[PDB]
């Protein structure tokens, strides 16, 4: 998504990114439909 939004490290083949109510953003897993606090693009907590 060059230019039109997308100013960060692209999410892996089966991943996304959405902010939660907890106060921090997580990483959605499309491979198994899940979520995590640590990004897969690298492996560090959001």
């Amino acid at each position: 998504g060059p230019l039109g939004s997308g100013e960060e490290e692209p999410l892996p083949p089966r991943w996304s990114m959405q902010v939660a109510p907890n106060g921090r953003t997580f990483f959605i897993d499309h491979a198994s439909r899940r979520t995590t606090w640590i990004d897969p693009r690298n492996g560090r907590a959001s």
């Binding site: 959405q18 939660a20 109510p21 907890n22 106060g23 921090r24 997580f26 959605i28 897993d29 439909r33 899940r34 979520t35 995590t36 606090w37």
Partner: peptide, 11 residues
């Protein structure tokens, strides 16, 4: 904790 598993964060 939080972290809305794949089911809630889909709005």
């Amino acid at each position: 904790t939080g972290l809305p598993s794949y089911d809630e964060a889909l709005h």
